[PDB]
Design a protein around this ligand. Structure first.
Ligand SMILES: [K+]
Ligand SMILES: [K+]
Ligand SMILES: [K+]
Ligand SMILES: [K+]
Ligand SMILES: [K+]
Ligand SMILES: [K+]
Ligand SMILES: [K+]
Ligand SMILES: [K+]
Ligand SMILES: [K+]
Ligand SMILES: [K+]
Ligand SMILES: [K+]
Lengths: 182, 174, 180, 180, 179, 180, 180, 182, 180, 180, 174
């Protein structure tokens, strides 16, 4: 990581935080920690959360989501490359009006998928369906859409261009260069 | 071979895990014995820890389909599907040797939509087997749900009291 | 590890043929060979095809299906244990009026599954979708059902009891014993 | 693992039926060669029935069967069941013209050759592969009564065909639904 | 396996049945099948059950044990090489007066050995029931007190043929066709 | 890594490297260097040196959109090779500032890849969307017609520096700082 | 193996097969068949069918010396392929009775292989002795000059049946029993 | 193995015995058993021992050697393909005057090679050297040569053509076809 | 694992020494590229000393170094220590003429390219490999002041050379025994 | 896992360089780099090269050897533990009069060891034999011994005590302490 | 780091197996400590099961070569080459902690010609180490051959009586 500080620590001084690759407990908590630090540095200035992720752990992603909502600074989100599954959930969770994608980003949403005794399978199946239901409800809220839309649109993999994600309510604006924003 | 010779005495064995292959071999022997003589008892000796539910159901439904009475005998152990099949023997002709042990328990083992479908199917299987075992044991479904929630080991005498077998045989003095 | 009197050859004399376990080229062709043999021994007598299978290769299954329909004897089918996917397809393909299940059999139906360059992925995706359509049209015919029902009812795994399979049109009768 | 009757495949050999099932290997191909030579020796004046359910395999092992078919006196009638892909399709199309058949739900697939050191050696083996590619196209066009350029176009990528499409192409002569 | 009949089927004509190596469901049931076959052949003649086994599955061993007592023929036992754990249990289960060992055989006896806490509890309890029943039956075979067997199986207990005769596990040691 | 580290020292000269496979992590490191250099001075050119066989399409698009997004012109330099997504990024450099060294090689091709039919259908459609979008963008980079890119990427297409320049993928070949 | 076993039945017709790699065991089985046929009748031709990619040089020499040792002429037939030691044995057949089918292929090359310098020296010298001896024998089989074989086996040399015949490796190409 | 008897059992009726591939306890004892059987069938008729072997276990080879010397029938030996190490030892052990090779056979002789505490290594090293010495002495006897020749000529791998093996004393005659024998 | 002085290789970089050790990979080659670019930036008027002990590796990674050597202003003097084989020899011979050296017991080896799908793809990649083979021969003949046909002859198989033989060939200019 | 005051860098200040374990390109080049560094720090002061190595790559060892002889400082060598094969070669290559061993060191010398097509095996066998001759000539010079002695004495592994190595000419003195 | 700090107190550790790398790290620390002060004692703490003979000899010869006295201390265990090095400490300054254990034993580990060469070398090594240990212990070579034929475990007191160490230290009260 090229020092100049290492490059990512240098960009954190500009209040940029990256989520790259799969969402795990460790990658999620490092994002969380940066969020908490930037709030400590300045609780009123925007934070810029750059997401390039295929998704990953649901609980790890929820640690990021809840921290984004907790802290005082607005967390603006930007998809580069892709935001799929939990990546898309988090992209759509950015401060409304400050959710962005670059022109050739790809977004994808879908229902939960997973890798004992019948009693235990019942317990975990019921929990998995509650998780599916909660994510559809939260996403509907982010997207300003009907819950029935999210139930329909996550039954199988739903790949979206940047424009399709904006029309869906998942992001607010597509930025090709600086000139954009409106 | 020894097992072919004993088939001539109308003896059929279930030994070791219940698989599609081991179950169907039992099914074929049952159908053969019925073809040779549809009216004479068959002796089904079970020493098995269980295995596949559908493979076991192929044996169960064959036992009930064919004309011969299928007498069952537990030697060593009959656990899970082994115990189900032991209890399925013709009533009055279900036996265990004195130091046999029985064990009964509930069934064991993508997208959320698919997990839901399969969990539902597993719970349907669990209830059907409990209802069928209750019928074999002349007990209630609620007793079987109770008593199979975790592994439930039974001696021969305990199995007889429960209704899974009719008699314990030390020797031919019934 | 077969007993000898072998048992499956002895039962082939009673015109009984088994499909047990996954459908592969080798397991399917052994069935084909038995069907052709039985037709050779007597072309007018029914054959009894006992099925306990989770399915497998579609093309291997189609070799069985087309042989069942080609040969002169009626092929009666019996599900014991389970008939899932291609197994269910074959169970439903037996001579109408002679498709049976034992009472605690399980049937399951679903759409095709698969467990390079974009051009080639395109060619193979199109072929898998053609297979999906053909099997729905064929199953709808076996079941005396509408294509739109089969398309719907196979989108995900669809488990059926013996009585549900009868109501659906996949089998004709449930047999509890030799008095049904 | 084969039923006894005295082995079922040997029993069907008495009916002049020869199977090719699964991948074409030196050993599986020579087994077909051996059966063809045997059937010709037993009676050179009766057709042989070559049933194919194969995804293909080694080109050279396939040519050993091909040249044997054409060498011996009997007409080798071919039948596709399940599938005949790559070398399997080549051999299906090589059956005596007028005696090439498919069952209704069999599928055919044709394509150009595939393979799964020093530059001088890469050159040598590459040259041989393209020689195989051109030869097989020339022979397939001959089997299909088609122009070489059609086969060149149609074998660049995997080309799947239903029995009706394969008949229209010239690879088979007739589709058999049953004994009618 | 050489042929004459293969060698073991030929010795079945002498009513000799072998248990060799680890006791498994499959090895145990093959023994049961031979015992049942010999009883059908002649229920009034003794069977000679030669044991060279380190032990194995308790339930597989019990299937042989109960069959030995179930069938009409006397089941004479002979240890060659070793009879350890379940092998020793089966050796001592022979018809009393007809349990034998060769002079350099070795016998060994010991106690049985091998999820959610609830399941561990269930299985530990079953293993301890196994422990008590096995001690109860061995004391019966050896004509000893339950407390002796409890004491003497807490850890591995190796016994010579003479020691095994002294304990009550066998009746006679055979060097030649002696007795 | 020699220390002054060598890559940070060259970052001072606005040199950024893409070496080896394009992954989420290697692509994002480039993005961070591009963003950093923009912060340091938004009007001076950046020199993006590429020796890469390709890799992830979406990881590469993250580099692409960043190149087009920031104010600095991103000049590209192929050294060794620029294949697939590497060649894509070489061609995305600011028109007039795309270069290769004389024995560099470029290669272009259509996308490559290494469940249920419904899902296979969804991903096949998305892959063909990717193929079309990339052909559309490359045709623009090269000031060529889409049908030329469709034709010219059906299989691996290797190009010398001189061939890549004529194609419109690069602007100039640089032997030294006097070939400009 | 179909039963009459198929290979024993063809052994009655003095047909012996070499299929797949030449190993000590496959080579010695051929030797035993050749010796047996000599015992049955020492004056009638033997037909040695070869579909082999080669294998062990010494195992192959055991076949060679046996062919030359026994009284019967050993006619050879290449089907599929005869490569390396396989082609060597094809060419060792009784001159005038070496054949190939029309789409057979032959390949020839120099020996291939897959400690202390003193030992490496010993085995390198023995391998070059093998190379020379085999080139010397092949030149004789083909009625050609040694320098031609040295030149023509430096790398893999693939030959059609027509090319192998012109070379002197085979005598005739057989389409059927009328091409003779 | 083509029945006609299987082919090798058929050739055993003509008193032909094969050793093919590596010499192991099991392959050696099967050769031994055939030797004992043929002696039982007829103790005065020659036996023909065809050898195509790279060698193998020294003790297993010695079981063959000693059985060949024990039984009443002469054991004539024939190398086809190759006879290396213990294969060569056994080839050279055939009845003198009846040791043969086909024209392109290869023979090879060499000293023993092999795949704890120093005391144990000493014991096994001393045994290995005794084995080396005994094989050189026995081979010298088979070859009618000086022991010093065998010590020299087995220090490293010594590959021999059929003619070189005949001149060495290892075989008696090379047979190209039936006409040979003398 | 490098001694501290501030790292030893960085310390020798202060003396304008650059090492290539072991296989040429994208990452090891770009590390050399980076050091060359750094040394030119620090002082374009001083020679760089490129010490090579390498068995070769990726041709394209080697070309990235080659083109950089020729691109930058400094003379890149090369020195063989231990060995320079394949791409290592190519780069050694590419040093500024008059400044190519070997130590007395170093060894050089040159050879043609090596490599360690569908026939259409085999053709494409084979064609590129032979293009690499001809290009490298043309460039080596240029480095060695020799005729192309000499390099064609002399690189067909592994060609090992002592320092004195490599000097006579034209690959190096002088052998250095010590500082004299 | 080095202690810090790191220890090997601290001892490099006293002009001590270690070779420990197998000789590889990387371990040899680290030594070369230290030798060149020490020469740079002071070209007239002795360097102390401590060797505990079983040997390894000949070409990597030759890179060390030629650097020892090239640089201006005398390189004194010290064997501790063992110096086997290339380690012994390097121990013996130290400045004459300044080659030492500790009293319980072990030295061992032997001929080279190595742990495709006949043509290539020939080329490489010839190169291994050239290496064998060069190392014998060079060791004979270091030891002030005849080539015929080194040829003889390296045919198999030859272990030497410190006193035997002195008598042989490989070292000059055995050092028991700083009073020898 | 902790070990760098203790090196400042002239403490050097041998922990775990003796390898070329672990031995040479010890050698380098010994030479460094001598360079810093050639006259002050060095404290070499050994907890080792042994390992490579030649790697151990590199330490041994360095201990004897450098000017500083090398005091040795066994903590935990010193077995095989660990025990050899413990006994090699400057006489009068070889120590063990009270529950240390020592163990001594003989050395442990192609063509017949090569096996002969290496077996001979192994037996030469065995005798040299026995002669050297005898010297350290003020014992006879024949005692050491006797007493190392198989693993010979010794307590601290047994090791002191044998001559491998001089004193057992419970604390600084020598
Ligand atoms: K916030
Ligand atoms: K019944
Ligand atoms: K029909
Ligand atoms: K024909
Ligand atoms: K009894
Ligand atoms: K830009
Ligand atoms: K002949
Ligand atoms: K004899
Ligand atoms: K330059
Ligand atoms: K010097
Ligand atoms: K000292």
């Amino acid at each position: 990581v090229p020092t100049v500080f290492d490059i990512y620590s240098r960009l954190l001084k500009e209040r940029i935080v990256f989520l790259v690759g799969p969402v795990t407990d460790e990658s999620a908590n490092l994002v969380v920690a940066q969020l908490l630090f930037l709030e400590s540095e300045n609780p009123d200035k925007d934070i810029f959360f750059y997401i390039n992720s295929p998704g990953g752990s649901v609980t790890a992603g929820m640690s990021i989501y809840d921290t984004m909502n907790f802290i005082k600074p607005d967390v603006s989100t930007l998809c580069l490359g892709q935001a799929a599954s939990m990546g898309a959930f988090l992209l759509s969770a950015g401060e409304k009006g400050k959710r962005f994608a670059l022109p050739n980003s790809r977004i994808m949403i879908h229902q939960p998928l997973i890798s004992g005794q019948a009693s235990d399978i019942e317990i975990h199946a019921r929990e998995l369906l509650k998780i599916k239901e909660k994510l559809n409800r939260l996403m509907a809220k982010h997207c300003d859409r009907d819950l029935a839309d999210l139930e329909r649109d996550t039954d199988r993999d739903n790949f979206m261009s940047a424009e399709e994600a904006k029309e869906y309510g998942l992001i607010d604006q597509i930025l090709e260069n600086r000139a954009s924003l409106r």
